[PDB]
Design a protein around this ligand. Structure first.
Ligand SMILES: [Zn+2]
Ligand SMILES: [Zn+2]
Lengths: 51, 51
DNA sequence: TTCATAAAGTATACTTTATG
DNA sequence: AACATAAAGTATACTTTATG
């Protein structure tokens, strides 16, 4: 959970790991400070409001 | 601290300990859910925007 | 023109709800 | 329906700013 990952939605590198979603080590959830949106790495994404 | 303390501002008992201000154990800072204002128990209080 | 303390702000890590 | 996962929410714990 150290490596910095690009945002799949906006492609920025200004991202940060936040927490493991659903108590699962296979669901590392990140945040993209640029698009103000979370994503779960390796999981599916849905269209959420930017902000 | 877990003892519930009355809010010196509005007198309510719906208050909660939150944290030690300034990393000082002598500044236990509480929050009054009623008036929506923080206070440091035993410290000086100032007129702050309620809310 | 510096510092302890009061207030305000923000990151963390959990919990609650939404989605398909 | 219902269940795992995506998203959203929130107590907690820290950091930064304001005040006198
Ligand atoms: Zn992004
Ligand atoms: Zn009060």
């Amino acid at each position: 959970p150290t490596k910095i990952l690009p945002c799949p939605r906006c492609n920025s590198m200004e991202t940060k790991f936040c927490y493991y979603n659903n108590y699962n080590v296979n669901q590392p959830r990140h945040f993209c400070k640029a698009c103000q949106r979370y994503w779960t790495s390796g999981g599916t994404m849905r269209s959420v409001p930017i902000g």
